[PDB]
Symmetry: C2
Amino acid sequence: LRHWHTVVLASSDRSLIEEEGPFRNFIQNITVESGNLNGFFLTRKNGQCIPLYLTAFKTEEARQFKLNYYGTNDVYYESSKPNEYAKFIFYNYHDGKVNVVANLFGRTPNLSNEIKKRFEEDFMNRGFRRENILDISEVDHC
Amino acid sequence: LRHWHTVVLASSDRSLIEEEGPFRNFIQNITVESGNLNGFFLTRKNGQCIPLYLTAFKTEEARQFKLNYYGTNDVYYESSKPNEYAKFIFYNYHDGKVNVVANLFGRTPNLSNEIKKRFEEDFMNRGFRRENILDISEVDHC
Ligand SMILES: [Cl-]
Ligand SMILES: [Cl-]
Ligand SMILES: [Cl-]
Ligand SMILES: [Cl-]
Ligand SMILES: [Cl-]
Ligand SMILES: [Zn+2]
Ligand SMILES: [Zn+2]
């Protein structure tokens, strides 16, 4: 779980992942430190690209983490092929309101259409609009 | 996962678990079938306690399930004391809106103070009012 790229972002609240949104972050590296996930991202804030470091701390159960950011978050990791892609589902609690932000990471800037399609269908199968899924592999970003 | 009782309900949207709420259901039994969880609950409607049968389907993750109810739900099972209690977290997706409904089940109508307190503070630590936690152990319910 080293070198990564954010390929697709999906959220119950589109603004969370729109330009300069709190969850429009682009992963660069993920370091596992004592079961915790040390993430290094880049993000655009007021006209520039800036570094963002966040640690998702382990919990009583594997693949589930806790992260303090834009409130609190329950983080779940998933992947059939851990060396090809990584999926992180964030349930963000911001002042009493809950939102889900799904992240699809790839070893390179893009991922197979198969992986991306299933990721996107799963999101849509949960009642979310296609407009809320942002494939950033086809977009220039930080 | 036999005999169970709903002891505490907690939700990001209080109305979901108050009277007439879609998630104010009382577990009676949980039967495992092919990795799936077949739950039998009671629901209060028009003065009567009515049966509610729902199957939470397995996934590529042992304690994770999928459930079609009041929209769709990603369900997670947790418990450090499997024969004493069961915790089920429902991330509900209804009309593009996300809500979290946590259920604490006991072998009997009530549960250890230690278990209930940990459950309750974990929920509160995510920015929710104590108002959103309903301990029904002493409430006359189905
Ligand atoms: Cl690369
Ligand atoms: Cl690169
Ligand atoms: Cl009993
Ligand atoms: Cl009984
Ligand atoms: Cl009742
Ligand atoms: Zn690269
Ligand atoms: Zn009993």
